[model samples]
Target: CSLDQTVAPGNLTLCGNATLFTTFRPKARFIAPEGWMNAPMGLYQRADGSIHAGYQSHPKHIQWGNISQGAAYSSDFTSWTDFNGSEGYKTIWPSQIYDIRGVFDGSIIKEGIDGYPTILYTSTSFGPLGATLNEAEGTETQSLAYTTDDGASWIKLGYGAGQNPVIYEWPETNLTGFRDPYVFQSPRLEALLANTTSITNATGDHFATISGGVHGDGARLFLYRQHTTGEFIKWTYLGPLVTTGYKESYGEWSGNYGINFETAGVTRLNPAGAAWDNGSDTTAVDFVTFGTEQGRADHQNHWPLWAAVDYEVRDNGSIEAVIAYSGVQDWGRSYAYASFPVEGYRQVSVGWIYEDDDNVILAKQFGYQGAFTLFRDLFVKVVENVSPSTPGLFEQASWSTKNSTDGMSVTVTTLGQRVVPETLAAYKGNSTVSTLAPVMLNESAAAYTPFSSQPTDRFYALTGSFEFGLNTTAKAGFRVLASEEEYTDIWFDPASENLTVVRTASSLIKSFGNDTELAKVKLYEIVGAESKTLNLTVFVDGSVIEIYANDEVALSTRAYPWLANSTGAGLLADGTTAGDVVGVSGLELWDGLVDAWPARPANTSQGLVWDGPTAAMYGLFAGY
Candidate 1:
């Protein structure tokens, strides 16, 4: 490698010719330096209560080089500790001489094999069919590494001959794109047969990783299962786990990728006549139950949400419920969900938020870059309302409401005040004033200036309750006020009575995409009631907006305010019919994601700056 200007620490060059230095460390998020891309491998909690994660990182920015496993550890999800060795938080790299190019996305098994934390990753240069090092230049194959003292250090297994690259090619398919290994041990799936019945000594202890083989048709997960031979140093390959062959009208979806399974007993299929049922081709993944190991895998063509899977044990060292990322939305282009456990039933997952023009800069102060941090509220119940027609195939789950009030109204202020207080505290950099408080308004022709403090802060969550009389046509909800002409409207429809949100002026922005309908979700049904009530929670984190209602419907969308004066919040209520009026019973609003920092100071200079237009400073300063 030739010389280039040093950008980050320790002579880390941008490329042959480049001009981008490292930014600050994440105060509330886990982001790589400016010259690297943060691709998640897997997250696992150790016996010491510290959460360790590995990801695919490229140290040299413009040209993807030194592609290795990036390491980071976090005691609490509030803050993280990145293990930047010589090459940009890359604790593990390509080992064997033959497989020396890439050590891409791997899964960590905290339950150590032979009393060692094990990791299974991919080597892009693995030679296939017992070929020499020069022959297998471009082939992707599996490799193993284990850590002795927790995950502080890892030992890459298989250096020579059959040991180094644990290579295997499918009997019939092209083995071009075989990668992303997510390994787990399932007592339920320990058996070999489709009907996961009695576990036998023949199958032995089930050790498996759901990996994908992506060909021209799409992606299909090949389940590599094996028994404990020589204490997991050797693994046998099982056939492809649940062959997805059916195709329907939505389009031709092949199968699942990045499969992580846990035993929540959740995954299920949907009914035939459901409104959201597009087709097996277009919507097989969508129809399945999420937040379980069984069904929460990403489809090649579909961008459906999925959960992170792991185990939670009791103090006595007994098994607890297999917790999964049940309710969190997978909010990245590559389907990323980095979920970690918290106190009680709640768990949080962080995802990569992308830019419009290949990582558009939302806050002007941060400059033009790609990718941002997003947190998902993963605390909800995931249950199967219906099962699949076949045993292996998964369908949809029944979405239950937070409550079912016949005609009575209820107040919900816990989220803004009590629930997720620490999470709200984590994103304080995104706030303008001290913070916006919750407000309630009555009557159809009224409004509340709940967010008048800051011109724009980019993060806020507000929940408003709406009520109406029978056969009433009323509009009640919140509107993100960029201005009179450039605001986004979020309210329930008069005809459907379900929540309807739209980004009216985000299309007018520079790089902001016009597909604002990507965020418009019609998930809830409102028929067969004395009268219906709407409880809509709108979360505005930077350009992204997620509307969650009744714990049943969730619609995540994005926006970009064109002018500098794009910041404000207010209520909307109107009575379409003469006697039918809409009113707000309870309203709660928070400033949004607070600043997150390490328990001990890592470095102040390495933090993401959250500076935007507050309500008062919209056009006053002009620069900001």
Candidate 2:
């Protein structure tokens, strides 16, 4: 069947040709106009309130090659403008000798060079030491660039002097991979070393962590101290700030930390309900997020992970990190997130949501392969009495400190992630809100009930509160992107206390993997009540779906429905006993979401044409 364009109910049109897979392209998230994109980089807000984001992109082809940084700007996160379209908005390309092979991921130094926003990025190429750009090879180096006109124009720090690759040498020998530098000003770290001579004698105002792993040891985060007197050009190697065993899993919830890490960085997060102290208080915790390679069996063997770390300053002027608790950041296909501070106290992030199609032919046919996950606000959530008056409460929290008087008073802390409020507000206007009737399930019947009023459009949001009957082991959930023949089930299993997404019947295409994605989440027991409720919120945007459970756990993945009209939504209750019942207290559906790219034409495939300088790089992987 030939591809056909259909306008969505909200404000934009979609390529509703499911047979060609272009229909899977996202409409409400930040994706490059076309070609390949992965791993958002250099995210920072400007003085005018607009946020600038850079991403790893190959604008000339659907397959990954000739990597460069694509730029975009957004004020409310829903509406975006491509910076590449502006004449003087200098973008990063693989032009310099140091990064000729590829300009990879890095972070933005908010005001590192002459009171301007400077970029400390990874530069990759064939090195002078006979090193290639292979995974195990060592051709990665750190380089610098700065924008004086608030990101409108950029100048490579040493491009004219042939002194690029500002920090070229790796700290240790035989590193498996070395890239992705994340630099930040840490008052907590400065205060920890205040009494030591290291502070009085230091000349730097910031610290950095570069992700990599040693040859035979394991994953490592290399630390460095900036030389403030050297205009942010000179850096002093501090040492390995953190080291861990390869493929180590603390438990079922704490996922495996793989052989090598990418985009690893740390920030301070205050406990929930506490006033934001900018991470300077002793009660604050150090939160770390990173991407692990070869870590899991699914999603191309990649995983994004998080950890609450405890930092201690050693007598020898070195800092050590103790992994207090760790887990998978997103238990699905999303990976390589870039987090930045917004509104001075809140931290937000965006990640790369890669496609599951293993066939390169399909990728070329679709003309795109990746989209950014919706911007998420990150915080630390503190829960007391996580479980009902039992020692089991300790296991529920990510890390807990038990009170001697009663075990139930244990204070537990975990990560909290939700979609940014600005984006949610943008999706809420002029939409149909349907309050679904409560559903009850008993042994007589077990089936999915199609909603009386399904979403008129494909993109929408649904939230529900559910309770399971006493001692019941049934499964209950909702289905989105559903039809008579295909549906993606986002369900909760009482026996396993797991929130899972079953995609076995999501698509008819065989290449789209049917792996079941899951995350551990326990129901919150109401105080002084015998009942417990599980809260869930799901956002469906074309092929991408993000499910949030109790704001504590999240599962993000891609789903492609073979039928163009498979936009139905419904509820399900199944595998129950005679006395088993599942109760839904409340459910609401928000029918339509405004398209993020309203300015783009309706028929534009991904966004725009490939106007980059590397047209020759296209069609190189055609036969594959």
Candidate 3:
């Protein structure tokens, strides 16, 4: 049976339904208990050492309206406690006059207000109500609330004083859009201006960026500084940190920075580690991360992008930032990213993964829509060439390159991403692993070969290594979540230096259309090896598939299977001549992932309350 508005969201079950909900639901990722969810926000640690995460959600319906902030807390990253189910916990809603329409995305200041955690969020005054919100007319404003008791309850700072919207006006006149404030502290900025105390002395410790764009100019991130710190309610405009032409990209490797930007942030990466300190290291690089609207033709036209950012202090005391090297953060339907620090050093990030199937009717039937990608650790990776044999070692690293002629040495610095170690440990703790023997394939053999014993379960992880034969420019890789009729193909081409995911036959459902995702990658040769080798890790959780290649590139996408017996895995090699060969050194499969929401209450509700007019307009009956 299909679900409808009459079905209470809490009644939705994780399994036993003969619909897409049971077949395609993810088992190990963080999804809302029900309804529409997107854009993780306000990730921080509480006093008890537990982590709290917030997101944009409309828990009442499976459509994108009546936006409110949903919340959860986790200690192990493998399991979560839905805060909406607690009685005293107050989830941020559209209650204040300034935020009556909806509560949008923002960041959490761990101790911004009187030593209490404060949340600075975008407040919408006019209309998520209907067609004419006059969004371009400055309906979006930055407002805040603080929690004295560690998030059990929140007290809004500016209800009676008419000072709610701390930032009400845009820096420029004709901006197309504005929202999503990302706050950060720049040690590099502090160090650069140490001698010039005039600029440093006037500003507070924190800096923030609000994403927007001019009507005809380009996308921009307006920078602001905390005004000499009272309650952090006052901010001084610092001008646009950087602006770029719409639909502009550095190259094929970098994604397009589109018509508008959202959720933009900046962080300094020290080459010694991913952390930032006093900026003593001259090799530290500042990196900017943002999501672009109208980014590309594929992946629903939204993309998460990153770039190395360089700053120059202008004569007018304003800071100007220039984009150095940029690239696509994720090669699929992941967007609206949020990042936070862990253990005072490592950086962790997560993003909203949108569904490929855009059928609102199907979504309503399933009673859920979006999910958060696996949390990833962000760091700066340095690769140095010890020997003089390779001429262009710098070409493999995308971010920065340095070369020396005397020693023929090269040192490359690039962004590094991997699933956070805690989560990986949790997955391993809950899984049973098996190792498979090595296999070699030549052009004379069949193009595809199924593993002798394949994983029959729907959720599993695979890790392996592969290498190409000498003088062979063949394509080789694996097929996962495979069956006779459906399989997702992930392959690497040595000649093209591209890793590609082909989802043309990934699903039997006709609505899940075929598409291909590609990212540039390079294989490295060992000292005594005849050819280059690549290490790969693939995670398949029902419909969600994530692939990591050599710890440098990651691709996330979705696939739906109609058959009950569609869980299978295999290897593939496609070569042009008889001498071409591909060798798989080893493969390991891990299954039995622990469910992330095993403890969630089976019949909990979001407990949303609305005013009389809103109740009547939205048709919210007593049960709703």
Candidate 4:
């Protein structure tokens, strides 16, 4: 949601090689003084690398209009640190603080206290209906002032600040729209708390609010368990970490970033979730070593969520989960502008993840048309699948390994077509079984069908598998009766091109596939019209249907494919076989490539990261 500098970074490694859009804009944005400029609380990365951020303001830029703060900084993100001031803009919405709020909106890691530069700004002069959502302001008579520093001077603390006493309670609902303060640092209870959300702004009082801004629950975001220090301990709803990456979610709002050739026609826009990721499983390297005992979940505490930490581990001590990223309406404008750093995701795999590691996620990008622009620097490096055995977009796009804490190595290629699978296409071995032919979850007990498909060209890894003593909450398929046949159909019409894909839910949400336990599996292509004949519709909602094809390809069986991405589907993948690869392999049905049709690979629901936001959570816009 940043905007300044035009865009940069991606020398590559940009966030551990990235899944798509990690983040950049070394400098330039970070607005807020009286609205217009949005989120971006704090981000500093200097060593000559330069990048300081903080923002959020509105109320005519404060002072008397009320309160607010922030500005901008950057040396490499591309260039930002211009300040004109007058309260005309920069408001310090979330200036800087290593230990005030303690990393509020940055999913993990941001600790620095050999000094004093904390970023966790959330000043209020009139913002949030002017403190009406109050836990401190509403009834207490009201008075406010914010800033751990960035704003330079201002810390009223009158209604709250030593922090308050909320600790959560939204089920029946009645908190009246809570406040902002995300800081959760607990090795069990080392310290810190401020995960906001819960506001009922009138209407019987609905309650809860977060992502750092927007109240009344409409904006959405919760978790404030600062048990000690400043103590905010209230609100822990934690529901949607990522639901509407955005092709069109409405009530939550999000339409752009998903569709663009505009003029007309293809305008379904943001909806599928935000950015390609029907991936069945729970990625991020299986969430980084799956089933824990594996350890490593740090959340940057340069100090803020509630501030706590003396430091000096050594015994494999881990506790970093600084989860926070709340930029809206393109916030400040870039360089995380007022806030800073947000892009791609998955960066807490420290066992010294390949070198120079302080805990992972780095991809900076630089040079030439770079690849085409948006600002180039396609985030991170080492994406293993890009021309691999054959086929293009390297199966679907992958390459990450060559780490030094990872931060730019180059090679971003593919402005389109991407898959990146291997690990036997991506994990689900144990011999394989699920069949899905005529249809059968007939799992009398085990034949296997509680939602199968778990391979991995990665769309999250598609998951399902639930047939317990079974009650309601259900969904997993395998009843194939009516054999209409013709599973794959190559392009029928409405075909054209121009390329534009975004998978950038805004920050960190790679190749997503929601996360099974429910199911739908898909790979259809029955295009009809233009002459029909070309079938391939493997839908097995989980449990059944295997087609591997040996010598270059043929067709086999087992189960675990986890489906969802046919790209433009034009006629769904037309890769060949069902009836001989029609349009030659979908996408680009001629019309002269027009612009190259890539407008929006449909955004499998908006959440694909290869470094595009800057490192918010893992950046790439954290799970559309």
Candidate 5:
């Protein structure tokens, strides 16, 4: 938390250096047979020890028709095994299920009808009612599709109410304009509640149940409670979710409209609105209370359920929900994902109203309809600080050990060289001239380079290591490297092994993946000459180590070298015949985060073990 201070004594660390990892459950973009995607819906643990996550498939991969399409599946999060027509007929979008359609779009999945753990989903297309697209008639509708075979197959109850079937009316929430039916059984009332995202334009007809009316292309949540088996018929209008305002708004998130959570429902086990002012405990909105409170809310310019919309909840029963839909999504692409914190999660009585912050939708469109954010694979949770000492239910072990010598650190080089035939004149900010010891590469050889004629600029980094530990299990070592802030000025001379750069320090950190301006470049350490020139290990587990040489070639690594015991190292410089070359830069070392370590000598070829093979993104293929 405190950049100037060190991490707490027992804080858990992600160790950013891990290369190969598998998730307890893996997901995908629609029928993810084979490729990289985000949002995963139907997660069924296969017998072969894999999570067959079927949600939405990528546009480039599958072709869809008729009833939209089903998603692909994946056992491991890294490798997805596609299930084309084998699973069902589907793709990410309609019209061009196989074509490379737009990118961002929301998705849905089945959770359960009650505590009885079952599968549920939304029907993508239909006709007459809420189905036809790009037409003067027909609207988009959601249908209830469930699987009793543990995800082996599915069955949709169609769009009807109290048909010939005895269990027909059991799905009470059925409406002409309703779609994406989500159901959950009430543990208290011994009843069922089905929630759905509905549409209400001039064509589909609106509902007085809705206070603010329908939003353009924005999804709205409808609440329906069931009384008995084969008679679960009762529907109520909550409010608009996915806000619909201006497409041109700077950040789609700030528009004056309700935000469509898209994650099925928003209603929770505990309703915060009823419990707020009354200072009482109403776990599951008692029908009588919720109905009464609804009137009070609308009249008072508010909603009874407005208080429960939050991402974080306090001990006293207050809520603070979060949706990064605002600014973060406006500038760049978004990664979408799924969650089920404590089972039954719904969006029943939520109000998706946004103040007029320059209401404007997106100028362009993506996969489904609006530019939905991309799918992400990460989540956040709060836990007590932990270390190597307290493994507890800890997910990782590296944190248990103590800090070592080959500490990890970041270095940035502002060197810009102006070559004068045989002279090297770097023009960054400073220079690093040394003949010290290095663990991975030959320090002297690493520092020694052929002269350049043009004004060359570079960001260099060398690693080192030592021999020390807390116990036999807990070691102490340091790892360090330099940063160019993801600068892309380097190139490789295929004929020769020499790397070159073509730009100046003007180019800052600009990229989608590796951005290192956070860790600058610096020349540090002069190791004891007992072993090689110097020894440098990885800092804070797997912090990034970037070596920006010339304006052409560069080197990057996950974790730094880790060699225990012995003395550390220092810095140095060389290269004659040049102008005022400062080589001034900054350094960042993260142990539990700050394994801040470093440099010496120069050798580009000697102890080199081309990281191209054993580097990150290497075995990033199917089986891997």
Candidate 6:
């Protein structure tokens, strides 16, 4: 049963402080409550529709010095209420067993019979990667904690007969660093949507918990099971469900890799009809492509990308499927593949933005101390193209190989806009007088105005078309300048015949991943459009840029600009030095990043906003 409204009846300090927290604290996307760091773990989709999110947190700066797991709730994914008091503390400090050294990643589930919230998290230990459980080498192991009263109080379950940590690793695998547990009540624990009135005993099928680990260079998926009622401490190891990759071994084919450093999760799919082929199988993930008509075979894997075949009610009373991390590829950006109708998922991308891309110290001054900007590719598919809503953020005009009836609309195979020239005195600016393009241009090689009339903008979108001539160099795209010396070139290259974004110039800036440079280049190939023209759309939000071509591809990448106020956008035609020209038309440019997020309800069982009147009035201090 649901509880009634009452004053927050817990230690006020335990709840995160609301006052010290600032809104949109520069550089952070979901402002990490004053002290906690990083994001999303122990994701629990509560029955009431509010999402309960636990984070990997530390006391001081960012980058994993995690001391405890923090708690927060979000009715809408945008705003969060840290579980401090009724007012709430930003970070949820630990108290009892298992997590004294600190709580790492795990999952949370509400008991079916009593509604008590139980958390299964990786607990305290010491290792090369971090605190991990290793009974063999003798470190620590995953532990448990539960709260009968929502999340206000905690009781860490102990280890012994009939206690907790029902699951553990066996020495046979020789595994360590095994973490990130996904515990869910399978059909046997509680039937689909049957928990409200169904039996809570472990009677139906096996209650399974999947934990990812490594056995060498190869990663392993461990599945543990239990057959008990109202308890979880007696799980028996069922062995690894799947294994991959290669790591060093004493003998054998010579090596096997991989281990506990990996992340793994699963989602089920049972459509009314078969969603995939049952023919002779020769691939790990081989599906007929929809747009590109290309199938992928990968020997390596990207973990933390998981799937859950649960169900979500639809507004239309019809239920489809519950899919997560369905996109088979990371594609340079984290594109979440879920129960998207046709197996395609969307993008929740993170890109790097530097105030001074060229200097590490200066970058910190500009607000980038290993900080990144997060944004999603807000795409709305349509049969007919429309003008963008936000001006300066977007503009749409026509383009072609030939000019339209009006003198205003025309197309061509040539376009070029130079960046900071080799030398200032030799830099003679050029103009659009001789060019048939729409954006600002220079008459001589010395003139430089990246954008036509608009000043530098940090967030913007560029959309247009590429109609090719006989040779089809119809290249259309953007060149984001970090400075004359350092910049990123994002364009439709005829050589790749795809939208290619390369950060060749970014090597000028030295920063994090000190030894490893950022991914050099990515391609977004527009397939099956050989008979017709290809469409192009670009979204440049801070350092994150996403290019959508022919509605078939979205190539997202991170860029670091070196020059001061290095925010410039310009178009080009290849007719100058290159081969055949491109017909660049239907050009549109806008200045701000518009959000196209799905709607949310006004109130959820957990309420809309995190703030509670009781917390403000009674729980904490003044001004909260």
Which 10-residue window of candidate 4 scores lowest in summed lDDT? Answer: 260-269
Ranking by lDDT: 2, 3, 1, 6, 5, 4
Off by over 4 Å in 3: 1-19, 85-90, 127-134, 160-162, 194-201, 271-273, 386-397, 405-407, 469-471, 524-529, 576-578, 601-624
Across residues 1-624, which tens digit of lDDT does each residue of candidate 4 receive?
221222332223433221222121111111221111233443444334444444332222111122233445444332234344554334333322211221122111133212234333233222232212334332211122334444333343323443322322332233333334333222221211111212211111111223321223222233223222332222234332211121222211111112110000000001111121222312211010100000111211010100011212112222222211111111000111111122331111100000111222221111100010011111122223222212121222121122123432322221111111112221223223333222222213221122223322111112122121111121222211111211112111112101111111211222221111111111111112122111222212111121111001011111111122211111122122323222211111111101111221211112222323543443212211
Best by lDDT: 2
Model 3: per-residue Cα lDDT over 303-361, one tens digit each:
79888888877654567788877877788778988887667576778898888776433
Best by TM-score: 2
Model 4 ranges off by over 4 Å? 1-90, 93-103, 106-206, 209-579, 582-624
Better model by TM-score: candidate 2 vs candidate 4: 2
Model 6: per-residue Cα lDDT over 575-620, one tens digit each: 3223444455666555443221122221111211222465344322
What's the lDDT of the predicted structure labeled candidate 3? 0.73
lDDT (Cα, tens digit) per residue for candidate 5, span 1-624:
111112221211222111111100011112122212333344444344444444443332112112223443333232333344433324323332111121122222333333222333333322332211221111332333345544445444434444111121212222223333434332321111111122211111111111111223332344333323432222332323223321223121122222222333332333222111122333332221010011111211211111122233223221223332221111111122232222123211111111110111110010111111111111111112222232121221101111233432211111111111110112111224332332221222223221111111122322322221111121112212222221122222211222222222212211112222111111122222111111232111122223332221122222111112101222222221123111212222211211011111121011101224432333221111
Could you give the candidate ranking by TM-score, starting with the highest? 2, 3, 1, 6, 5, 4
Native-to-model Cα distance after best TM-score fit, residue 113 in candidate 2, in Å? 1.7
TM-score of 6: 0.55
Query: What is the TM-score (0 to 1) of candidate 3?
Result: 0.89
* Pairs in clash, predicted candidate 3: none
Q: How well is each residue in 455-477 modelled by candidate 2, as lDDT tens digits?
A: 87568998888877545688888
